[model samples]
Target chain A: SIGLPPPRGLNLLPKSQTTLNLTWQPIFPSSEDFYVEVERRSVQKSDQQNIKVPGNLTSVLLNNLHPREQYVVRARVNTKAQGEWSEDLTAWTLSDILPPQPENIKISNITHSSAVISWTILDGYSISSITIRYKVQGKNEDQHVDVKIKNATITQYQLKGLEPETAYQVDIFAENNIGSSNPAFSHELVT
Target chain B: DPVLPKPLNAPNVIDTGHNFAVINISSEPYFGDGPIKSKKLLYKPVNHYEAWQHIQVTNEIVTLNYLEPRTEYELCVQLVRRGEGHPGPVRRFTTASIGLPPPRGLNLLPKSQTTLNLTWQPIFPSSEDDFYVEVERRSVQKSDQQNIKVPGNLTSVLLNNLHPREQYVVRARVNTKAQGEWSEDLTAWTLSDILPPQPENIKISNITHSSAVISWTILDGYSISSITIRYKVQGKNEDQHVDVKIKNATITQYQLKGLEPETAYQVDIFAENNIGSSNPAFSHELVTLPES
Candidate 1:
């Protein structure tokens, strides 16, 4: 018996917007090679894949992961004599998907410099805020402002500080814990 | 007293491109009504709170440019006879929703081992302010990225202090007043032996009745395979091609011969390498020296 202990001190770290960093302590009788296996806990074991790394390295980054997922990770020492597997460490990915797009965008109650923009929020998501992007007609870029709602019940926003008697393009987006939704668009003329 | 020409017929709007349309108004001339004194078209983009655009016209057809694509518009015509004006019924037409086009002719100019220069032709050069360029390092093991906002009129940019010998993928698209889509991506590599950069600061001078001199700053590194000058008479629809093979990198000036006297020409300069050709540097309205 080589008398190698199971891997210990297993830790999973969420890095950046789309990656997970994993680290663990190696067994005493470590081998020349090590393998790390990560599995989406919600899925079947057949879908799991193992990652190989050199024994000298204790950390590895798992890249291109989906947002808001639970994962189970374990590591093992791969040598002339294989070692026991480490205890499975569980971690959840960060929220990255944006809220669903707002519906039925419309602009009304127009004045020279102000107008009312309204829309309906999609159900089933926790919305945090809404953003309105607007620009003058025939211009190069759009300017934007954000409104905090923190709820899905509110659907109307009053746009202020606009130019009078000008044509404008307006779009609205809803944001949640994950990210922001696609914009709903409408046109307004400041009268 | 002559009665005003019976209310002019409603105008018909036709889609030409994104943000452009043609208005065609047809009305029979009232033979005895003092030959229709004036014609007018009033247009307003629908579902907005703005004033209508009033345009004066002398013909039955007029082209409207710089409109929002994929939007509704209301247009009407007015005819005047002997100072009496009659307005026609309002007509509603929707512009086609032609999304922004991808950037054209993406070129990667390797500046050095640690730097790269990028240039591309915008689909709507006049609306360059409407877009942003995204340059990303496509690596499975690393994340390094850059986003550049370039004006529509300017097309070239230099990115410095990049990772040496690293591969990159860059793309560009309109940051439209409305939400816009990203363009197709262009992939390139930064290496010590990459292709030469595009020529810079093209200028035209020493113009004469029949010819002019064109000059540019050559890019360093890698030998240039050839330099081609494509020119055309301003306002003419035909293109003139001139190919000049460069024997050495030091030669930077070319005299354009057999040009028309006292005519205006637009010129483009292209530098070539084994990898590919560079994005052209264009010159505007180069008028030949008038005949003495």
Candidate 2:
């Protein structure tokens, strides 16, 4: 009955590809020698690492974690005696640094002034938008124009302002929150 | 001589409306005390189990107002002659039912092979006159709707002589006055029909020494019970009818077996829907290859 109850609720969030942020409800302040103990371990492997921070700090930033790996963490109070550890909370460090390229991009339903481009994402990659690049092929002083698709749910888009009876080169790129993937090229299609 | 008037009698209900009721009580009994001093009616919804309501009465006939529609009520008269005189027996009355809440809580039961058993609950027991059910076949366009009239107070009916595999839309309503809304639509599908539509586009291909392949397409909105392949040498009077037991609705192509080499024959295909088979389709003449 004299032991301090463990920190009540713990929340863990991945801040980046290599770092996670952990925070918990504060334990009652007792003495100047009080210390907060945090235990972290990988879900796949059996490596246990413990960290001790000052009692005043209720949050800690876990550094240098592996990408796409799941880590579990808990917290307890360590002053004159050890308190019970809190329940485990888990977060997956992101493996996505650069967005994956759009797959199966195709140009179809061609008319004199418009063409349709359809594509798919690579397994829920973080996509902020899609940039469609196109230009008239085999032309003198060819200039490519870019069309930005901002909707994440739309996989099909019809591009207008195309020239009749001319072969065009079209390329699409998947953009992430802060990055972009390689260009997915469609075969030269003629209107 | 007794001071109080003779014991009073219970009130009698004469007529009722959606939200009002008319009642009467015999003049307070005469005990040589002339007419009764005053009378007040105590009333409450019979099922509500709440306190009784009081209404002063100077005349024999009284109409209770502000009553809920279609609710049963218990009422009695209290005579105050020699201070709280004996109370009369309680009488029962029900307000008129006049509502047509959109027909809801439809109950569907397959009472017959093809006919549907329709039942429902109206928000208020309809008093307009009678109720009606509208049944239309969704599977058939421009099909005449089968309207069934239900007697007032009856909540169920049997939809008879319906086509199998037909999707029917059903709804019910109490023949109420100026109804504000009607019931939502309910969908009921008849049992699967045994007879699928006629197989069309019969063709012959991949002819061999003793066999040929016959393929055809079945039209939409029909179900298959069984498929049969009929074949024989052209004009030989030896038609072979083989019941190609189907998987069976999806199979479009079937190989014709047991034909003589170097023989010219025609093949036909047909399918049945429990009732009977559809019209037969004959493929063009196919000549099997000579033996290798």
Candidate 3:
């Protein structure tokens, strides 16, 4: 067989927070006996995983990955002789689970109709929205209000619809693309 | 016996609109008695059989309002006399074309350093109505413009041959006998620009007890927009950072003042542009000068 070129257009795309779609331009060798060797390593971990795919296959699936982690990938052909490895492609995986709760949850600036809730997210978990569930101290039903997330600059939320001079309790949840986290309870607040 | 209106001639379409059709009113059945009470117009969408929708009017020259545009409908006129009337023969006509509206929910995906994909909801029905996609590049340099024609049915298009870090205004509109308004503007850029190369050949000289002059090579600095210098005393983090604008291409040196005698300082120079600053370039691990 002639000289074997490294796989071209090697790309790694995130199929999900826990999976990756690896693709390359399969090298077609004059000899029929061959396979593609894939190498994957995480930035946070020192160990690398290897996979062997049929020579004719130009794509492969890599699953069982962690969210919010960076991965490095490359590929090459494995004939009776070894082929050159492709260039490195490093990318970060997105978050798939609910964001973790914030710390030091405080409900302050209380008044008859509204109060301000502020907290700091302590973890790297992704958050899309925050939901506040509240009710009067002896009420039968709780009302849910959703507050949009603002990038790092602002961290406080203002709650409305409080009855005049009523005692209330609030539970907050942070929502990510997948779902919501457990509630972070608020101190017994009064209007 | 009160006179009943006779079976009439087929209705004649005088004019057509996007949502209406005008029927010749002068052809109403009349017996020359007290003016005929009211007339009825019966219509059904057909080119193809359909449901009946009727409207009544005191005057006959009727404007068939609220009909679906570009659709064929069978219509007939009936004049009323003594509360009795007979429908005339039926005639079919199509309303005028309804102008196209812009595509819905235009979205932009900056796919790479030179490609962007435009997507939208396409709801127009006519097979002949194509779409025109226009893109205009916004930059300090010359504006590059492109217009592409795509089939109206395709919901997305991937545009190529665009420059990196360049902003573009993209829009789409219908093109046909019945044209449409332009969709909302989608402003986006091709992917981020290439990061500036690292500054090289750092040299420190003219050391004084409390000040020093640092110079670097200008060879590879052409890719950068500005120069940044970060320094701190040895064994500590970079505490003082200064941004130096490149007024002339050959300007490649900066002076550091307010240094402590007999102390070692750590210095790093960086080449940075709009994309980002790259790794720091260092001349020496420690700038050590004995006390004067």
After TM-score superposition, the amount by which residue A20's alpha carbon in candidate 3 deviates from its true location, in angstroms, is 40
Q: Which parts of model 1 have CA positions greater than 4 angstroms off?
A: A1-98, A146-152, A184-186, B1-113, B118-292
> Residues A1-191, candidate 3, lDDT per residue (tens digit)?
54467788877776778888987765545775888888889988775889887889879988878887788998877788888888888766667556677778877897876579887774444454565555456644323223334343357766654667877776666666587777645558877
Please provide, for model 2 over A58-116, each residue's C-alpha lDDT reduced to its tens digit, 9 standing for 90 to 100.
Answer: 78988877776778998887788788877888777765678777777767898986678
Docking class of 1: incorrect
Q: Top lDDT: which candidate number?
A: 2
* lDDT (Cα atoms) of all candidates against the true structure: 0.63, 0.68, 0.67
lDDT of 1 by residue, A1-191 (tens): 36345557879866644567887765443444444443334232334556766666678887766666656777766566666777777765665666677767677897865568788875434454666655566654322223344444567756555556777766566776677876545655655
What's the C-alpha lDDT at position B287 in model 2? 89
Per-residue lDDT of candidate 2, residues B66-151 (tens digit): 98876778987776664335567788876656745555678765543377788776455535454444433333433647776666
Model 2: residues with Cα > 4 Å off, grouped in runs = A1-191, B1-140, B143-157, B161-167, B170-198, B206-211, B220-224, B235-241, B245-250, B257-263, B273-275, B279-283, B289-292
Among residues 3 or more apart in sequence or in different chains, the pairs in candidate 2 whose N, CA or C atoms overlap within 3 Å are B194-B273, B194-B274, B195-B273
DockQ of 2: 0.00
The parts of candidate 3 lying over 4 Å away from their true place are A1-191, B1-96, B121-140, B192-194, B197-292
What would the per-residue lDDT of candidate 1 be over residues B129-194, giving only the tens digit for each residue? 344444443432248776666655577777766675466677666544433466566666565345
